[PDB]
Structure 1
Amino acid sequence: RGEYVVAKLDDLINWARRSSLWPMTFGLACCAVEMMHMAAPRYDMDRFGVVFRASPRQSDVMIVAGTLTNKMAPALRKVYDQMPEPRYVVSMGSCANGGGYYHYSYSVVRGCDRIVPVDIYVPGCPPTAEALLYGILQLQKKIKREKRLRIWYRR
């Protein structure tokens, strides 16, 4: 049966991608400090297979951890475009989510989703390190639900 095979192959690639999520070493403001605390020993994001890598060419996730200003917006879009696919964006904190405390500023982008597509929105100012980890595990369960091969089979 073709369906059974592509169903199992979807599980394999979905498992491999969520089990090995490499965020780009990309932080913007206060929220990056809680992101640092997710890598710290108490939460040890490495133990889920989550490893920071500096190069966008070697990153699977962009965690927008902090305010995105207008001056920074073209750079964030640049490094997002330079990530190979599949790629995911996690929006962390009120600033990234929708402008937050600086929503009405002349120099702030009112939400990073004006610039890049966003898979998960982590609320808080900042979200606790555990709240960000909950957001990453939520991203994993989203990847687990993907049906690329199943949809390809029925094209």
Structure 2
Amino acid sequence: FGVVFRASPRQSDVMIVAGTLTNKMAPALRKVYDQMPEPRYVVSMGSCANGGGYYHYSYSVVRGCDRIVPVDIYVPGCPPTAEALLYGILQLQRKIKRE
């Protein structure tokens, strides 16, 4: 589909946020999001960081991934099947195409 995982945000755009987020971790996340070039996107993934998901009630989680970055598409799952993810990103393209 042409998408290719390349490290270092400056050479990348869309961002996947797989897996549970935590408190200490969050500021680094905001850093990385800020250092991306426009037109940056992100993608919340799983029940993980859509809103804490399983770990919704703990002192160290930061509920949704939404509360630190402006998410685009959500891909609910726990884990989402990789294919449901694939439908996710294709849906992302069907959202860029409307840009």
TM-superposed deviation, 1:102: 0.4
What's the counterpart of residue 98 of structure 1? 51
Structure with the largest fraction of helix: 1
Which of 65, 73, 81 pairs up with 2:26? 73
Q: Deviations over 1:62-118 (max 9, x none)?
A: 100011101100001101100000011110011210001100010001000000000
Q: TM-score, length-normalised on structure 1?
A: 0.63
Q: Scaled by the length of structure 2, what TM-score is found? A: 0.98
Q: Secondary structure at the match of 1:130?
A: helix
Query: Contact conserved, 1:95 with 1:103, CA < 8 A, in 2?
Result: no
SS of the equivalent of 1:98 reads coil
How big is each residue's C-alpha offset from its partner over 1:34-61, in whole Å with a ceiling of 9 and x where there is no partner?
xxxxxxxxxxxxxx01001101101111
SS in 2 for 1:142: helix
Unaligned runs of 5+ in 2: none
Rg comparison, structure with higher value:
1
Shift of 1:142: 0.3
Identity of aligned residues (%): 99
Counterpart selection for 1:107 from 60, 69, 72: 60
Stretches (4+) displaced over 6 A:
none
